[PDB]
UniProtKB/Swiss-Prot annotation, chain A:
The gene is UTP11. Involved in nucleolar processing of pre-18S ribosomal RNA. Component of the ribosomal small subunit (SSU) processome composed of at least 40 protein subunits and snoRNA U3. Interacts with snoRNA U3. Interacts with EBP2, FAF1, MPP10, RPS16A and RRP14. It comes from Saccharomyces cerevisiae (strain ATCC 204508 / S288c). It is found in: Nucleus, Nucleolus. This is U3 small nucleolar RNA-associated protein 11. Belongs to the UTP11 family. It comes from the Eukaryota. Disulfide bonds: none annotated.
From Swiss-Prot, chain C:
Present with 6560 molecules/cell in log phase SD medium. This is NET1-associated nuclear protein 1. It comes from Saccharomyces cerevisiae (strain ATCC 204508 / S288c) (Baker's yeast). It is found in: Nucleus, Nucleolus. Interacts with snoRNA U3. Interacts with MPP10. Component of the ribosomal small subunit (SSU) processome composed of at least 40 protein subunits and snoRNA U3. In the absence of snoRNA3, forms a complex with other t-UTPs. This complex can associate with pre-18S ribosomal RNAs. WD repeats lie at residues 39-64. Coiled coil: none annotated. The chain holds residues 257 to 320 of 896 of the full protein.
From Swiss-Prot, chain D:
Belongs to the NOP5/NOP56 family. The gene is NOP58. It comes from the Eukaryota. Required for pre-18S rRNA processing. May bind microtubules. It comes from Saccharomyces cerevisiae (strain ATCC 204508 / S288c). This is Nucleolar protein 58.
From Swiss-Prot, chain I:
Belongs to the WD repeat UTP18 family. The lineage of its organism: Eukaryota, Fungi, Dikarya, Ascomycota, Saccharomycotina. This is U3 small nucleolar RNA-associated protein 18. Present with 9570 molecules/cell in log phase SD medium. Involved in nucleolar processing of pre-18S ribosomal RNA and ribosome assembly. WD repeats lie at residues 106-147. The chain holds residues 358 to 535 of 594 of the full protein.
Amino acid sequence: TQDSNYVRTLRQIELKKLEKGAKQLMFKSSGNHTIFVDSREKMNEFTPEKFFNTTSEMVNRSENRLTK
Amino acid sequence: IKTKKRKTLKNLRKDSVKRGKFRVQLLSTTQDSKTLPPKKESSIIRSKDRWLNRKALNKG
Amino acid sequence: RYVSSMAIDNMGQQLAVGFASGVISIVSLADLQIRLLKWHIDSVLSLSFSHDGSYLLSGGWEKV
Amino acid sequence: YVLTETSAGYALLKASDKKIYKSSSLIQDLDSSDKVLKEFKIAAFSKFNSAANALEEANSIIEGKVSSQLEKLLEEIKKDKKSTLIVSETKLANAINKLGLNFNVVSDAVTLDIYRAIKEYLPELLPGMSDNDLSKMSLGLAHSIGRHKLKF
Amino acid sequence: VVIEPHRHAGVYIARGKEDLLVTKNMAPGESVYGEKRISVKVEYRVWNPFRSKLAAGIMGGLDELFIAPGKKVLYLGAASGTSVSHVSDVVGPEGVVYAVEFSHRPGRELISMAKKRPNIIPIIEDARHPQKYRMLIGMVDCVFADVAQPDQARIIALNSHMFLKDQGGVVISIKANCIDSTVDAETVFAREVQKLREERIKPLEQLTLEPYERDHCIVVGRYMR
Amino acid sequence: SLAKSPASTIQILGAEKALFRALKTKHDTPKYGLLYHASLVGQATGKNKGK
Amino acid sequence: NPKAFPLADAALTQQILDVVQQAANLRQLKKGANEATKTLNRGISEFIIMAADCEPIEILLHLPLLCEDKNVPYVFVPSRVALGRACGVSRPVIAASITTNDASAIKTQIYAVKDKIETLL
Amino acid sequence: EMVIEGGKDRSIEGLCWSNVNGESLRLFSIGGSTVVTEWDLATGLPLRNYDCNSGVIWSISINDSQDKLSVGCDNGTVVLIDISGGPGVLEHDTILMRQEARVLTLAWKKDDFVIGGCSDGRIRIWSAQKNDENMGRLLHTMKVDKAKKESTLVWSVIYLPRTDQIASGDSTGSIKFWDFQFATLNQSFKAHDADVLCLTTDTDNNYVFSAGVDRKIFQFSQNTNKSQKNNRWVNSSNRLLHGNDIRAICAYQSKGADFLVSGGVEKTLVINSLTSFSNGNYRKMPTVEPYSKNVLVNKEQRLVVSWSESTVKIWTMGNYKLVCKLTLKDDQNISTCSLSPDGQVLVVGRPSTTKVFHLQPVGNKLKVTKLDNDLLLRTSTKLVKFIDNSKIVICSCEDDVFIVDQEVELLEVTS
Amino acid sequence: FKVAHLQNSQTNSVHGIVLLQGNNGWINILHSTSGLWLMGCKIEGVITDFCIDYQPISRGKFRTILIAVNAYGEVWEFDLNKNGHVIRRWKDQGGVGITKIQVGGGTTTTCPALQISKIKQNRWLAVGSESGFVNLYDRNNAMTSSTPTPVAALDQLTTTISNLQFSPDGQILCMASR
């Protein structure tokens, strides 16, 4: 029972290190973004920088896009 | 034209195409949403009639 | 509508009319409401009740 | 030719309309106000405006969270008794003080629109108060009623 | 060590040793719930996309988040300060958040953080009766919903028809299991955006926030009239 | 935060350094903690003050 | 008791106590409120069963408060006596935590009962 | 009297009336979807599509005193909908205590309890009595005798108020009567050979009629004084009247009307007598009585148009030859139609829009072209009847009478 | 099965019934001379055991009650001298795996009455369980409560109760485990 106590407190150390290490990281989002539009031409077009505003740097990663 | 008429029909009728990471859905019309109740869920309607036409009751 | 059998139970509450078509009909004698029992495919030849009146023996042209 | 009962604390406000009672309870689509349409349609008739007294504030708060037949509403029935006029209540569950004695009350499906207008422009013309003062008296009433219901 | 701004002021990205999202302070000096504090002379509280729900929508990318530093916002579902603290940080001392909840067990810490911030005013009444807090405040500039009740569309429809000015914002967080389990998120979210555009809410975007929550979505819309 | 802790924690609540050295090497943990100065534990004598 | 949220009906409580009996035979439950909260802290509990029968129920209704932090299912059954019979001791048992396992023989029964629990949340 | 049509891929599985005394009739109906649909009887349109907040609705029932509405859903939920707010306005009330299997049929005891048969072979009893301690939680569960080689589904549940029982038909064919208090079976009959889809009762609960996919209607009677003082139903009678199935059964009983009405997979209706079921006579209705027509002819070109759901077809006499058809699928539902004399322009018209098509006989075929008119495209049409080759008269679903190609003054009626 | 006595209750004619415990909740009662199925009583759950109680009514008339227990602990009492209809439904306090119910202190099926006037009402009712717990109810007062409390819960032997029998006077109960 005391070496089970030893392994259990080692496990709890790593558990707390895990949770308050993952609390201070940032993970890349992966969500199905959906945009609702009007009749058919707004859907046929490219969504023309409606929130990208550059098609090179600030389009395809969404953790912070920008408006210059 | 015989082998792709349903293809061009569905590809012109259907909406919500992809744009890279995104997907551009159409919103529907108050016309249809206020003239009709929504369609049946074919899953549950098929479940009920497939049950009433299961093989264990010998229909004929 | 020809009747070939009849039986009564020990209280006179119900009565079994067995017809030549094959059916049986339990009438309830206090109010003359009937209940049909159809198994005999030929004429019903014999009916009896049990003592408590809750079982009806019947016999006909099938040897059953 | 009508009044409307609007509250912000213990301070109740029976604000009269700049049109007829039928015009108030019939159209309601002509305000669309930026500020001037609500300023023209508005008329600060009666303001039973109490203070930051916790007793009066929590009393009208309980009467707002329940049926609205409080003493301030009796004061409004006193200060609007002209010819059994038409009133616009906020909540339909205040039916007792809505139709208790000589007041043709109406609160249905456009009364909410005119309450949207007058609640959008309460502080700009109805009192002699300012926006931070209205938010401070609202949060004082809110903390009072919160610590009253949620015990300590 | 380098703080860059976001699309919405009051929301920043602290890049450097940990490129992680962050808001300002309206609480001078202290954290509220043990969130990490970064100073760059100026104090900053880290938002978490897992501990909170709006931060996950920001991290998934919400362009016209109507929570914005020149408004006042109505929060129907916090139960505790862990999200409305960051909403008061982003709305700043100019405006006001109305954090309205029903279950008074974590309403204690809700009122406790509303003591520290005058930005946050609490309401301890259920959000299907907005008439019980008619007499407290009206005409908000953006509603937020985090209720996990089945009548989400009806509750926020009543709150937006009573307290939301025209052309304002609606942000609703929808859990799929609180409406319908055993059927997938795509059908239940399409059903809820149709249920919400039955009211005068033009839907703008939905996103599913998948690395932070299982089977959730955030739907934004503009209140028509 | 004290109420949502188990009763074993409330037993050893004061003696954290003795507890965690006696767990991080495989030794015997304390039995009194901050609760040693209660009057009932004062009335007890022997191993039954641990009890 | 009014403040014992989700309480099970008879069929669900019969299958809850059946899986409690076979977990007690497989030595896969921690019986008692302090052992249940220890498994809640360590994150090795599948679901928590409590008894809506203790005369202070506030000696119980604190492990809900850290069940809703670790999103572990919890349920109430009406009898502490019957929960003690199911756990297989001679005393009444107020709370019991079915611990986690991945090679367990009754893993499917545990999963079925915990899904029936989280339907009523 | 009237017909309320629905369109493509629309069905209707349950429907209930509601008439609070002094107010208008109200008609709610579920389809195969997540909403309840309340119809206003004037126009013949839905006036409300209330999306119930849990899953796909399998059954619907109306409270006694008709202020609440149960919808029993596919995810095991029973949702209460507050009806008494006025015609049209429906509120969510309470989701009752959940379960695993889908609840396939509902009934109410009174305003107090709600009984539900589910697809796991069980019959739950919830309490919908507001301001009780056990409101919403399921009080009892009963289990019917399962089939040996397939799953059992309880398909029909009714409450019998004269006694205190629940009658229940399940998919083994067995019909069981359960004492409500003590929640337990009194007697089981092994009546049908396959499922019992629908069962009903009369006013004083002297009879219970029942029917299902084995297409016989069974009658269970308790009319004898000994039957009433002993609480003993007997399997009285049995009739074979339907051709394929019986999916719906109901009963009406008044001073000059006592009939049970039944219909099924074969499309016809059947009327029998309630208190004289086995003895008396019955009437099998025609499968269609065209009070609203789907066919009309024009004497020029010897041609005839006919419209089924969302397609029209035209053929000529000669033999006969199908000259043209219009499977317009921009449409979803059809309604009435008329042709011009000389056979030039067809006009099809439904309660949402109408559309007019020029026709030109190109020989052994036709050529059909839409001619645009947005007034027609916006108007609701019931009847179009062609004053001239160009002028038609339009009756709108909101009681307007236009004359196009404009307004008839129409006096009002005493209400 | 269990064998018991039943009275016609329009004649004073008794006959033996055998009572068979079936699958769903069913008890099939049938005549002990002719084998005719008389009636059936269904309880809701897993039927595990049942017992027969008798109570006298007048000179020469008694009434037979079937007492059947769920596995979960809820007990049905069926009057079966009339049609097999429930008269009481109560719940065992505690007890989760219920294996064996027994009555005693009067005429049980194991202390049977030789003469119809010697039929007695049973005083005690023991519900013995899978953990070895035996609740003991005193039916001189525990026929009214509908959540009756046991007069004692015995716990002396620790594995599954498979026999529990009352002595004919009703002063000893015998717990036994196989």
